[PDB]
UniProtKB/Swiss-Prot annotation, chain A:
Induction: Expression increases approximately 3-fold upon entry into G1 phase compared to other phases of the cell cycle. Also induced following inhibition of mitochondrial protein synthesis by thiamphenicol. Phosphorylated. Tyrosine phosphorylation is indirectly stimulated by IGFBP6. Belongs to the prohibitin family. It is found in: Mitochondrion inner membrane; Cytoplasm; Nucleus; Cell membrane. This is Prohibitin-2. LC3-interaction region (LIR) is required for interaction with MAP1LC3B/LC3-II and for Parkin-mediated mitophagy. Expressed in myoblasts. The mitochondrial prohibitin complex consists of two subunits (PHB1 and PHB2), assembled into a membrane-associated ring-shaped supercomplex of approximately 1 mDa. Interacts with ESR1, HDAC1 and HDAC5. Interacts with ZNF703. Interacts with STOML2. Interacts with ARFGEF3. Interacts with SPHK2. Interacts with COX4I1; the interaction associates PHB2 with COX. Interacts with MAP1LC3B (membrane-bound form LC3-II); the interaction is direct and upon mitochondrial depolarization and proteasome-dependent outer membrane rupture. Interacts with IGFBP6 (via C-terminal domain). Interacts with CLPB. The gene is PHB2. Protein with pleiotropic attributes mediated in a cell-compartment- and tissue-specific manner, which include the plasma membrane-associated cell signaling functions, mitochondrial chaperone, and transcriptional co-regulator of transcription factors and sex steroid hormones in the nucleus. In the mitochondria, together with PHB, forms large ring complexes (prohibitin complexes) in the inner mitochondrial membrane (IMM) and functions as a chaperone protein that stabilizes mitochondrial respiratory enzymes and maintains mitochondrial integrity in the IMM, which is required for mitochondrial morphogenesis, neuronal survival, and normal lifespan. The prohibitin complex, with DNAJC19, regulates cardiolipin remodeling and the protein turnover of OMA1 in a cardiolipin-binding manner. Also regulates cytochrome-c oxidase assembly (COX) and mitochondrial respiration. The modification N6-acetyllysine is found at residue 12. The chain holds residues 251 to 299 of 299 of the full protein.
From Swiss-Prot, chain B:
This is Prohibitin 1. The chain holds residues 219 to 272 of 272 of the full protein. The modification Phosphotyrosine is found at residue 31. It is found in: Mitochondrion inner membrane; Nucleus; Cytoplasm; Cell membrane. The mitochondrial prohibitin complex consists of two subunits (PHB1 and PHB2), assembled into a membrane-associated ring-shaped supercomplex of approximately 1 mDa. Interacts with STOML2. Interacts with MAP1LC3B (membrane-bound form LC3-II); the interaction requires PHB2 and takes place upon Parkin-mediated mitochondrial damage. Interacts with STAT3 (unphosphorylated or phosphorylated at 'Ser-727'). Interacts with CLPB. Interacts with CD86 (via cytoplasmic domain); the interactions increases after priming with CD40. It comes from Homo sapiens (Human). Widely expressed in different tissues. Belongs to the prohibitin family. Induction: Expression increases approximately 3-fold upon entry into G1 phase compared with other phases of the cell cycle. Also induced following inhibition of mitochondrial protein synthesis by thiamphenicol.
Length: 49, 54
């Protein structure tokens, strides 16, 4: 059984192997725009008294 | 000594004892060599904020 033990260890050491992927994340970004931007206007002839 | 014990118990336990211990061990061997697996996502966020006009 010393032989078997050694065999266990050898097989165990040799055998193991794997690879995995992980992806830690979380999307947190804040885009804040307040009073600032433009709309649009048409053309109209105006005049004030 | 473990070998001695196993063999001894095997003998008391008879042939049937031997067979399934062999299969368990074989299964173990298969386990150790074979292990592999992976999981993944496609991380995309996105949420919906629905607002009704008033």
């Amino acid at each position: 059984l010393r032989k078997i033990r050694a065999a266990q260890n050898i097989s165990k050491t040799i055998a193991t192997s794997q690879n995995r992927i992980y992806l830690t994340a979380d999307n947190l970004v804040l885009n804040l725009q307040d009073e600032s931007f433009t709309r649009g206007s048409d053309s109209l002839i105006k005049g004030k008294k | 000594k473990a070998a001695e014990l196993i063999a001894n118990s095997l003998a008391t336990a008879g042939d049937g004892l031997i067979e399934l211990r062999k299969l368990e061990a074989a299964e173990d061997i298969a386990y150790q060599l074979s292990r592999s697996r992976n999981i993944t996502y496609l991380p995309a966020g996105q949420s919906v904020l629905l607002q009704l006009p008033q």
